[PDB]
């Protein structure tokens, strides 16, 4: 036997198993810094759980976040181990795990003057 796997994001599952071995619900924790004067938002180094099954993307995610703090579902990056996991993008396709943490980040872009 291997007795030793070689990358975790290497041999994911699609989005139909992976449904059948993460019933779920899950449940992630979101990272909250404390920034008093560093933008307009609720960010008081705090955790924000939510738990909710595989069906929707990550936006799910973002909106409930921006639903509680002044944070808007956009400008915040969700990190998932690293991973920089968009609404774009749904949780089951990545094939999380329960109990898993997505660390919060503001995003690096130039700046969009207007829009």
């Known amino acids: 036997g291997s007795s030793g796997s070689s990358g975790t994001e290497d041999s ?13 619900p899950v449940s992630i924790k979101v990272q909250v810094p ?32 921006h639903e509680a703090t002044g944070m808007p579902a956009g400008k915040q990056k969700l ?16 094939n999380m795990a329960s109990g898993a943490v997505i660390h919060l980040a503001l995003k690096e872009r130039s700046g969009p003057s207007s829009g």
């Open 79 to 94: 990190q998932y181990e690293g991973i920089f996991i968009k609404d774009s993008n749904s949780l089951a396709y990545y």
């Open 12 to 24: 994911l599952m699609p989005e139909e198993e992976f449904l059948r071995r993460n019933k779920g």
């Open 34 to 65: 404390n920034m008093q004067d560093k933008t307009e938002w609720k960010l008081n180094g705090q955790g924000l759980v939510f738990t909710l099954p595989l069906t929707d993307q990550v936006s799910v995610i973002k909106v409930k976040i």
